[PDB]
């Protein structure tokens, strides 16, 4: 149905928008795990 | 007078080193420095929490 | 279902992340 396809698009848009929230998390979580190791490995 | 005279006798033989080189610095500098590393974790953990607080909406 | 699993993972993230935020602050107030 045409209307059903519209709801899927709305779900995809919400899921796609939620994915954008998720990608920033990894970059932040990734960045932190990067930074901690670089700071520590150099420890004296 | 005797008590002070005792100190000078006390000082004469056991003390009177000209300089001192204790140098308690390699720990002080790296302690606050370690705290700064811990502080860097503070803000960025909070930023993550804010970022995934947006996940909840 | 995929979105529901996503949000559930988030809740696991936040409470753990918030829990860590507490102890890191605690190790700071003690210094």
Swiss-Prot record, chain A:
Protein name per its UniProtKB record: Mediator of RNA polymerase II transcription subunit 30
Family listed: Belongs to the Mediator complex subunit 30 family.
Highest taxon in the source lineage: Eukaryota
Coiled coil, from the record: 1-39
Assembly, per entry: Component of the Mediator complex, which is composed of MED1, MED4, MED6, MED7, MED8, MED9, MED10, MED11, MED12, MED13, MED13L, MED14, MED15, MED16, MED17, MED18, MED19, MED20, MED21, MED22, MED23, MED24, MED25, MED26, MED27, MED29, MED30, MED31, CCNC, CDK8 and CDC2L6/CDK11. The MED12, MED13, CCNC and CDK8 subunits form a distinct module termed the CDK8 module. Mediator containing the CDK8 module is less active than Mediator lacking this module in supporting transcriptional activation.
Organism encoding this protein: Homo sapiens (Human)
Tissue expression remark: Expressed in brain, heart, kidney, liver, lung, pancreas, placenta and skeletal muscle.
Residues making up the signal peptide according to the UniProt record: none
Portion of the parent chain present: 135 to 178 of 178
Protein purpose: Component of the Mediator complex, a coactivator involved in the regulated transcription of nearly all RNA polymerase II-dependent genes. Mediator functions as a bridge to convey information from gene-specific regulatory proteins to the basal RNA polymerase II transcription machinery. Mediator is recruited to promoters by direct interactions with regulatory proteins and serves as a scaffold for the assembly of a functional preinitiation complex with RNA polymerase II and the general transcription factors.
Compartments in which it is found: Nucleus
Lineage of producing organism: Eukaryota, Metazoa, Chordata, Craniata, Vertebrata
Swiss-Prot record, chain B:
Protein purpose: Component of the Mediator complex, a coactivator involved in the regulated transcription of nearly all RNA polymerase II-dependent genes. Mediator functions as a bridge to convey information from gene-specific regulatory proteins to the basal RNA polymerase II transcription machinery. Mediator is recruited to promoters by direct interactions with regulatory proteins and serves as a scaffold for theee assembly of a functional pre-initiation complex with RNA polymerase II and the general transcription factors.
One record GO biological process: positive regulation of transcription elongation by RNA polymerase II
Family statement: Belongs to the Mediator complex subunit 11 family.
Principal subcellular localisation of the protein: nucleus
UniProt GO molecular function: transcription coregulator activity; ubiquitin protein ligase activity
Natural source organism: Homo sapiens
Disulphide-bonded residues: none
Associated clinical condition: Neurodegeneration with developmental delay, early respiratory failure, myoclonic seizures, and brain abnormalities: An autosomal recessive disorder characterized by congenital microcephaly, profound global developmental delay, exaggerated startle response, refractory myoclonic seizures, progressive widespread neurodegeneration, and premature death.
Top-rank lineage group of the source organism: Eukaryota
UniProt protein name: Mediator of RNA polymerase II transcription subunit 11
Subcellular location as annotated: Nucleus
GO cellular component, one term: mediator complex
Transmembrane segments: none
Keywords recorded for this protein, A-Z: Acetylation, Activator, Disease variant, Epilepsy, Neurodegeneration, Nucleus, Transcription, Transcription regulation
Swiss-Prot record, chain C:
Induction, as annotated: Up-regulated by endothelial cells when exposed to tumor conditional media.
Tissue-specific expression: Widely expressed. Highly expressed in vascular tissues such as placenta, testis and liver.
Coiled-coil annotated residue ranges, if any: 1-26
Compartments it resides in: Nucleus; Cytoplasm; Membrane
Family: Belongs to the Mediator complex subunit 28 family.
Subunit text: Component of the Mediator complex, which is composed of MED1, MED4, MED6, MED7, MED8, MED9, MED10, MED11, MED12, MED13, MED13L, MED14, MED15, MED16, MED17, MED18, MED19, MED20, MED21, MED22, MED23, MED24, MED25, MED26, MED27, MED29, MED30, MED31, CCNC, CDK8 and CDC2L6/CDK11. The MED12, MED13, CCNC and CDK8 subunits form a distinct module termed the CDK8 module. Mediator containing the CDK8 module is less active than Mediator lacking this module in supporting transcriptional activation.
Role summary: Component of the Mediator complex, a coactivator involved in the regulated transcription of nearly all RNA polymerase II-dependent genes. Mediator functions as a bridge to convey information from gene-specific regulatory proteins to the basal RNA polymerase II transcription machinery. Mediator is recruited to promoters by direct interactions with regulatory proteins and serves as a scaffold for the assembly of a functional preinitiation complex with RNA polymerase II and the general transcription factors.
Protein's name in the database: Mediator of RNA polymerase II transcription subunit 28
Species assigned in the record: Homo sapiens (Human)
